[PDB]
Structure 1
Amino acid sequence: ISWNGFSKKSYQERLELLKAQALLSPERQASLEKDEQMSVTVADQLSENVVGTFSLPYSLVPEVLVNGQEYTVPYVTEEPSVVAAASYASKIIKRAGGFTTQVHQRQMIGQVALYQVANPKLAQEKIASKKAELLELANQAYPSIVKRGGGARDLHVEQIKGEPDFLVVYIHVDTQEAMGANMLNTMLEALKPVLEELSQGQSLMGILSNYATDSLVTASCRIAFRYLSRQKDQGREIAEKIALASQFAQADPYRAATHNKGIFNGIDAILIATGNDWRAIEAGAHAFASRDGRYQGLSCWTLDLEREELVGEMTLPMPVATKGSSIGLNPRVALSHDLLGNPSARELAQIIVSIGLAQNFAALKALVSTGIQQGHMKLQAKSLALLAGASESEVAPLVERLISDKTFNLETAQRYLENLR
């Protein structure tokens, strides 16, 4: 069954179409139809100083194709056009065969910072020689994850220079379906005294890192020029401009910020829907954006001229969860996971990066388009009118004729000012 007309349908009609798609159980469908919310009682358990609840829209982005599997994606966003743009981008990319994705690795990194280490290199060697015993100790500290098949997998020690110098111990941990904050903090507390003794130093802190480089996930898409525009060579032109737009975000931090913001319009929307911590994902991705010594766009758009295809690619750290308090307690979060077919965290991560790339595609395409609203046509024609050499009284008649045309440039405004005078 088709999703055609979903945006223009009324609220009630959208629910009927969704029901026809048979994506939700009878319980979840009824929960959605009475727009069941997280209660004050539940809110009061989740947070502190609770005096009520706060609501945002909840929307669907249909036809998200990821590794040959189609998803209907839930969005929570208060920004006009974000859902419409994601849905549009998703249709185009589905027609083009959808996204291809890979999880490079899925582990969490935690760190212990040591200071007042007289001999950092000797401390480094000592700790590294005790690697196996330290990992065992970390694993005994949180046995439930070992039983599930996860646990501490690696440990390394680095000298970080500054004022002062720090000796930093990093642990790499398979947290399975959890984000793993509590797990990592617990393992690090256990290691603290041993690491202090081995380094003859003082522990400053033991904490998870939100720079989740053991959780990188890449999405890509491959879009034939003909899907960008049906017109003869207009598709190639759009593709070129998107690639230039991509190059511009690599060059200018002022563009990069906006480029990456647009990606997170979509990413944060699905993160909220699925009960995931968006501050953690924002921080890791924006740090990742800076890795080459400049703040840069998180995605890349290039041309394959031989195959006549526009190629999009994006790698992000995506340590999302399918187990957590919000997932357990917010009835709409539980619904969002069911809606998606209850993906694993790895699967969810691949969907989310794809969503970001779709969102990026729509923003870039709209940004490089030359067909714009009537209000801005009257405005651009006014600029060309004045640029042609028009006086005060000559502006209004010149605009009327310019807007009557399908397309127009300076030479057209000069031609029309010539005839008028």
Structure 2
Amino acid sequence: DSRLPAFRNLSPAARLDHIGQLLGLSHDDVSLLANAGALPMDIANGMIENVIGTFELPYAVASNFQINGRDVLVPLVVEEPSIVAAASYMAKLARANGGFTTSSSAPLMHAQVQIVGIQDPLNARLSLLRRKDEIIELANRKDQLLNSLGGGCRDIEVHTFADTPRGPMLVAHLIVDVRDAMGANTVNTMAEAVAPLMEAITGGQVRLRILSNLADLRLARAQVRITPQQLETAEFSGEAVIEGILDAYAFAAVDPYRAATHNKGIMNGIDPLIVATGNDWRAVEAGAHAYACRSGHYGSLTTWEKDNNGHLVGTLEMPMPVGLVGGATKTHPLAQLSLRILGVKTAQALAEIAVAVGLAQNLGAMRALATEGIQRGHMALHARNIAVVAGARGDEVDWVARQLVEYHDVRADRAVALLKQKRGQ
């Protein structure tokens, strides 16, 4: 059961006790989070190069999430407030209608084998296509362990660029079926093995043999349904909020400026889940924004419609190059424990959850922005950080300043003013 009552009122330690009993975590697992230093310097020094210490970030747990009828706790690591509060509130609403319905495609990654110096790119392209099975088998022979797990190179698609500054070039794509692995290193290795053979055929000089972060073959999808009666507030009507959201969606669909902020909100929920599981967050961001820019126009990643039934329906489909047997994933003690809380068995399981959180996150920001400003809920949480920006000396009184300025007028302009009300006359 993901629903966690009065969880936000529980102290950090009390919450960890609750999550421990629920999940049935060992006392060894609970200590990794209770006691600082879960990451030993010898391990930390192994990942990065010039390691001198370790940097910490809050590690939270969102709730109410239901992916395909199965409840699940979502661990997040971020520094910005409201993200978890929002993500959980929206997941709570989705519960009433069956939670989040997700899916995904076969984990297909692609390697790029760039070839320059060919005077006949177009003719050379066919030569590679006829000897496709020959190149495929060469790629698989490299990684035998992958073929046994059910993965392996599947097909090859060759593309050309005749009008190029540095001249025409041929770019072959190896469509590799990795799995439970982001597959960066696996695909990159296959591209190296094939390079020689492709030069033998096209007669050009292979340059780059790297993968592509724009994983448009490895998609993850998520769906939500929101009844107007659920969004119904005191000042606004249920159907009124739906239209507001729809106006906000259209806006993000036509204006790239709003789309960048709209897509940023989606990553506010996805990125923290990636950092927790020890996955590459930059790879995820790169595949996301580039995908939003596929139709020659930067736009929304999520869609918001109003079905003929009158309910708000949203979706999120985007590349999700995540893993389970990755590098820092098996290495970092907490990245390992995060997958244990999630209960994921495959990488695609992780991707389906990642898009669900993103979708939930976007709906939350939009609902807020369409109801009445964003400063009402975000600043209430951010009332602590901003208290530090004003409190010069004697940061003890910051706690009290936060409770006073929380009267719907929270801002540094007022935070500096409330200081005199206590320090003097």
TM-score (norm 1): 0.85
Partner of 1:65: 66
Which residue of structure 1 aligns with residue 88 of structure 2? 87
Q: What SS does the corresponding residue of 1:21 show, helix, strand or coil?
A: helix
Cα distance change on mapping 1:257 and 1:71 into 2, 3 Å: same
Q: Which residue of 2 aligns with 1:49?
A: 50
What one-letter code is carried by the residue in structure 1 that aligns with 2:273?
I
Counterpart contact for 2:20–2:26, Cα < 8 Å: no
SS of the residue corresponding to residue 279 of structure 1 reads helix
Deviates further, 93-102 or 282-291: 93-102
Residues 23, 88 of structure 1: alpha-carbon distance in 2 compared, 3 angstrom cutoff: farther
Q: Residue 6 of structure 2 aligns with which residue?
A: 5
Output the CA distance in 1 between the equivalents of 2:288 and 2:212: 12
* Residue aligning to 1:198: 201
User: Counterpart of 1:177 in structure 2: which amino acid?
Assistant: D
Once the two structures are superposed, the pairs formed by residues 261-272 of structure 1 within 5 Å of their partners are: 261-272=264-275
1:24/1:338 contact within 8 Å kept: no
Aligned-CA RMSD value: 1.9
Which one-letter code corresponds to 1:98 in the other structure? Answer: G
> Structure 2 CA distance, aligned partners of 1:68 and 1:45?
40
Letter in 1 for 2:301: L
The equivalent residue for 1:130 is 131
Match of 2:244 among 241, 244, 266: 241
Q: State which of 291, 299, 304 in structure 1 corresponds to 2:302.
A: 299
Q: 1:373 to 1:179 in 2, by over 3 A?
A: closer
Aligned to 1:357: 359
**Cα displacement (A) at 1:32:** 2.5
Tell me whether 1:320 sits opposite 2:312 in the alignment. no
**Are residues 1:157 and 2:158 paired?**
yes
Shift of 1:280: 0.5
Task: Output the CA distance in 1 between the equivalents of 2:376 and 2:321.
Answer: 40
Could you tell me whether the CA contact under 8 Å between 1:59 and 1:74 is conserved in 2?
yes
Structure 2 counterpart SS, 1:127? helix
Structure 2 Cα separation of the partners of residues 47 and 233 of structure 1: 51
Query: Could you say which residue in structure 1 is the equivalent of 2:191?
Result: 188
Q: Does 1:278 align with 2:281?
A: yes
- Provide the C-alpha distance between the structure 2 equivalents of 1:48 and 1:92, rounded to a whole number of angstroms: 45
Letter in 2 for 1:260: N
Deviation at 1:152, TM superposition (A): 0.4
Residue-by-residue CA offset, 1:187-207 (whole Å, 9 max, x unaligned): 111111111121111111111
Do the aligned partners of 1:263 and 1:356 also contact (CA within 8 Å) in 2? yes
Q: Secondary structure at the match of 1:321?
A: coil
Which stretches in structure 1 are left out of the alignment for 5+ residues? 377-402, 404-421
Larger Rg: 1
Deviation at residue 165 of structure 1 after TM alignment: 2.0
User: Deviations along 1:255-281, whole A, 9 cap, x unmatched?
Assistant: 000000111111110000111111001
Separation in 1, partners of 2:269, 2:188? 30
- Structure 1 distance, partners of 2:344, 2:355, is 17
Question: 1:157-176: per-residue Cα shift (whole Å, max 9, x none)?
Answer: 11124222221100000111
Match of 1:390 in 2: none
Using the TM superposition, give the Cα deviation of residue 30 of structure 1 relative to its aligned residue in structure 2, in angstroms.
3.3
Q: Give the equivalent residue in structure 2 for 1:110.
A: 111
Which residue does 1:32 correspond to in 2? 33
2-structure distance, mates of 1:208, 1:270: 23
Matched AA of 2:141: Q
Query: In the alignment, residue 365 of structure 2 is paired with which amino acid?
Result: A
Unaligned 5+ segments in structure 2 are 380-406, 408-425
CA contact (8 A) 2:236 2:371 kept: no
How far is the alpha carbon of 1:17 from its aligned partner? 2.1
Tell me whether 350-359 or 29-38 shows the greater mean CA deviation.
29-38
Distance in 2, Cα, partners of 1:274 & 1:178: 12
8 A Cα contact 1:38 1:329, kept in partner = no
SS, match of residue 23 in structure 2: coil
1:228 is matched with which residue: 228, 231, 239?
231
Deviation per CA, 1:67-102: give whole Å up to 9, x if none.
Answer: 111110000000011111111111111222111111
The Cα of 1:36 is off from its aligned counterpart by 4.8
Task: Please name the residue that 1:400 is paired with.
Answer: none
Q: Match for 1:283: what amino acid?
A: A
What number of residue pairs does the alignment pair up?
375
Question: 2:315 matched to 1:329?
Answer: no
Give the direction of change, closer, same or farther, for the CA distance of 1:314–1:142 in structure 2 (3 Å limit): same
Task: Give me the TM-score of the superposition, normalised by structure 2.
Answer: 0.85
Residue 242 of structure 2 aligns with an amino acid whose one-letter code is: A
Which secondary structure state, in structure 2, belongs to the residue aligned with residue 343 of structure 1? coil
Aligned 8 A contact 2:23 2:341 in 1 = no
2-structure distance, mates of 1:36, 1:333: 14
Aligned sequence identity (%):
41
Distance in 1 (alpha carbons) for counterparts of 2:273 and 2:284: 12
Report the Cα distance in structure 2 between the residues aligned to 1:93 and 1:23, rounded to whole angstroms: 26
Matched, 1:255 2:249: no
Inter-partner Cα distance in structure 2 for 1:140 and 1:30: 44
Partner of 2:101: 100
Offset at 1:183?
Answer: 1.2
**Matches of 1:230 and 1:23, distance apart in 2:** 38
Query: What CA distance in whole angstroms lies between the structure 1 residues aligned with 2:376 and 2:170?
Result: 58
What corresponds to 1:308 in structure 2? Answer: 310
The change in CA–CA distance for 1:232 and 1:253 in structure 2 (over 3 A counts) is: closer
Shift of 1:231: 5.6
Q: Is the 8 A contact 1:36 1:332 kept in 2?
A: no
Q: Name the CA distance, whole Å, in 1 between partners of 2:274 and 2:102.
A: 18
Corresponding residue SS for 2:200:
helix
SS in 1 for 2:318: strand
Using the TM superposition, give the Cα deviation of residue 334 of structure 1 relative to its aligned residue in structure 2, in angstroms.
Answer: 0.7
Q: Offset of 1:370 from its aligned partner? A: 2.3
Counterpart of 1:413 in structure 2 is: none
Partners of 2:192 and 2:38 in 1: CA distance: 37
Aligned residue type for 1:106: P
- State the 1:31 CA deviation: 2.7
